[PDB]
């Protein structure tokens, strides 16, 4: 079974259509797969505040969502999180890295997002995520997550000042020329496996590039990841940061495309 958890709060959101997006991307899963879906947090209007203000506006959210995962993760399930912002996953991964202390985190994602209060350039949470999980700074929602379990896939042109904190931590690059299923596979080695995915590390949609090398990876590379990961050792999966009006033609294209990325996973669990 798939336990399906949706934040629908702010948690520093700078861009305009998240929450929006998360809730369709959120439908869509629901129609497909006969579930409903838990959803926590009041939307509220994105704003350019420091990470410092819009942390604690996004405390009630934080908690709730914390709370729905712990429950999911003690269970049997696949707990699936539709994040507006990856600033959600400061909640979850504590805890996933609490009960499964040797899951080796997937952080797929354009950026490292590994910016501490005193590297940041923009103040923005949402850079700040997954070096918040590792503890190089005090987020207020737990740490605990190794670094050398820490993977990012698909980064690239890394701030060389963010760069040098993610190899002094100890976290591995895959570039998005890189990452195949196999190099993702090498990475984890035997451990059970959580996904975090920021739909930026796409290719920006312009699949009519055959003569072009892509900058980031393309919707067949996640989902020749989703398709390699033994469904036995998948913890768990969060997407987020699809910026997409409701009611768009373009959000409905960009969760058909969603839904075909994560097809692999979600089917194997869906049949457990
Ligand atoms: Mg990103
Ligand atoms: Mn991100």
Redesign the pocket.
């Known amino acids: 079974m798939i336990d399906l958890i949706v934040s629908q709060g702010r948690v520093a959101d700078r861009a305009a259509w998240m929450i929006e997006g998360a809730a369709r991307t959120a439908r869509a899963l629901e129609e497909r797969y006969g579930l409903k879906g838990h959803y926590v947090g009041e939307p509220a209007p994105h704003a350019d505040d420091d990470w410092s203000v819009a942390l604690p506006q996004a405390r009630e959210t934080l908690v709730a969502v914390r709370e729905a995962a712990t429950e999911s993760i003690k269970g049997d399930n696949l707990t699936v999180l539709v994040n507006n ?2 600033s959600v996953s400061l909640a979850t991964l504590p805890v996933v890295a609490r009960e499964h202390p040797d899951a080796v985190v997937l952080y797929i ?3 490292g ?1 590994f910016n501490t209060p005193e590297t940041t350039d923009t103040g923005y949470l ?2 700040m ?1 997954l070096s918040g999980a590792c503890g190089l700074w005090d987020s207020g929602h737990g740490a605990g997550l190794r670094p050398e379990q820490a993977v990012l896939v698909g980064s690239r042109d890394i701030d060389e000042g963010e760069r040098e904190l993610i190899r002094k931590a100890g976290v591995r690059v895959i570039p998005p020329g890189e990452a195949t299923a196999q190099a993702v596979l090498d990475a984890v080695k035997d451990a059970p496996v959580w996904i975090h995915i ?1 739909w ?1 590390v796409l290719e920006p949609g312009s699949i009519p590039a055959d003569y072009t090398v892509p900058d980031g990876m393309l919707p067949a590379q996640i989902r020749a990841v989703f398709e390699a990961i033994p469904a036995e050792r998948l913890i768990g999966v969060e997407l ?2 699809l910026n997409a009006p409701a009611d768009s033609e373009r959000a409905e294209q960009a969760v058909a495309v969603i839904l075909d990325m994560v097809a692999p996973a979600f089917d194997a669990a869906a049949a457990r």
Do not use: I, P
Request: hydrophobic share 15%.
């Open positions: 912002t990856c994602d354009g950026h997002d949402g850079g995520v920021d930026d987020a940061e």
